């Protein structure tokens with residue numbers, strides 16, 4: 001059993017990955033020792049990268065996530081190391097490695113409970129960096145990014161600064177433009193993210209998000225009103241971030257309904 | 260008590276056989292009364308002309324499709340993509356109103372069936388469609404145009420060219436535009452205005468009566484839309500399908516039965532101008548239609564048009 005896991009790990013690191021993953025997860029110390037070698041290997045890969053090592057890195061991350069999901073002091077160190085190694089390798093620009101890293105980070109963060117003071121600056125920075133360059137990406141990466149964001153929003157409670165939520169609900173945010181995707185799954189996860197960010201308990205951090213949403217709604221109604229030669233109204237819930245914008249009638253109506 | 264009605268037709272009767280021959284069998288159901296109304300429709304393969312005629316003459320949406328006075332398409336037949344109605348049908352309601360159902364125009368199924376049977380069959384089908392259109396435009400009061408998707412850009416050309424091939428101060432029957440299987444987006448003020456403007460620009464020289472009649476706004480379909488919003492409300496009607504976290508429980512359009520009933524009421528009260536400079540009766544109208552059909556069959560303009568292509 002102890003030596004049989006090597007064959008499964010090697011096979012999974014080569015369409016049929018679901019069968020081996022399920023068998024390994026349902027099959028059931030040495031876990032830390034097995035993960036140490038994997039961590040050293042991925043670190044060395046990026047250290048020597050500075051270009052055919054991408055498949056190996058993707059396979060390593062996939063097997064790592066699979067063994068982790070098969071199931072508290074080194075979780076923060078491992079997460080920080082993974083985020084740093086992933087952000088450093090910005091030349092390859094691969095979506096498979098990013099998806100695997102996002103899934104692993106999400107499951108690792110969700111495994112614990114909101115009763116610690118883990119480093120949130122690195123996680124927030126990594127999320128913002130990946131979101132700022134997630135416009136022209138595949139559908140699989142978008143779903144993983146949205147689910148990951150949901151995991152950080154739910155896990156990090158009473159600790160999210162007002163700056164993060166403030167920057168997440170402005171025109172420059174990629175989520176606003178991402179909500180226009182024709183797919184339905186993306187819209188569903190986006191709505192889930194909105195409800196999760198709107199289901200907190202602290203009023204000082206939720207008031208800014210509520211005001212931003214109300215301001216966007218007011219801007220949409222103002223644009224719709226001006227589209228038919230009629231003066232705008234609702235000046236008691238306006239926002240400074242939406243002083244002037246150009247929104248189409250269809251887009252404005254869709255945004256109003258979404259909010 | 261000798262004032263009993265003639266008879267109540269439980270089903271329609273084919274007026275023109277598939278071989279394009281006149282059938283003299285509907286005279287027994289006609290009387291010697293004047294001021295009669297006739298209706299005709301031109302459509303594509305799956306627009307739903309038979310269903311519209313059934314629902315407007317002697318049928319209700321609650322009744323099963325198997326008892327329709329006009330044979331409608333079946334699910335088991337849509338797989339092969341074939342036509343259901345051939346030739347022209349005839350049926351008179353209890354209100355002394357004559358209805359006429361025709362076959363689809365430019366139907367690929369007819370061409371395919373004709374292949375396995377004078378230059379090319381395409382011209383033959385084209386002249387057949389032109390003949391049916393001319394006959395309808397010559398002996399009908401109002402003609403309803405059924406459509407599936409808007410912006411066809413081909414039906415208008417056919418209608419415009421069909422008016423120049425009729426046999427013979429001229430008579431121009433009314434043209435009613437109907438949009439079958441309309442979606443929720445079609446029931447919007449912007450879409451309605453765009454459709455009206457497009458129809459107006461596409462039928463600038465139609466020379467037919469297509470405005471000032473059958474106003475959808477006057478039927479309370481759009482309670483809030485003002486009459487001044489549309490530059491020229493043409494005779495257009497919409498019919499939706501038979502009887503979502505963002506907008507749960509929102510249909511976006513009225514009930515199918517309500518619109519069907521409204522269309523039936525508006526069509527039943529259409530004007531009945533004199534077709535010719537003489538009062539015609541039911542039998543007289545039948546004889547006139549037969550003579551017109553015989554004349555259009557052995558015409559000259561149709562032959563020239565067919566030869567030119």
Ligand SMILES: Nc1ncnc2c1ncn2[C@@H]1O[C@H](COP(=O)(O)OP(=O)(O)OP(=O)(O)O)[C@@H](O)[C@H]1O
Nearest residue numbers: 304305306307308309310331332343344363500501
């Ligand atoms: N409003 C509607 N909602 C749903 N189904 C419809 C509607 N109108 C028509 N259909 C369906 O589409 C088909 C239309 O065929 P139908 O026989 O009624 O007339 P058609 O399209 O004019 O055909 P044909 O010219 O071959 O006689 C039928 O299967 C009918 O059930």
Ligand SMILES: [Mg+2]
Nearest residue numbers: 309331332343
């Ligand atoms: Mg039919």
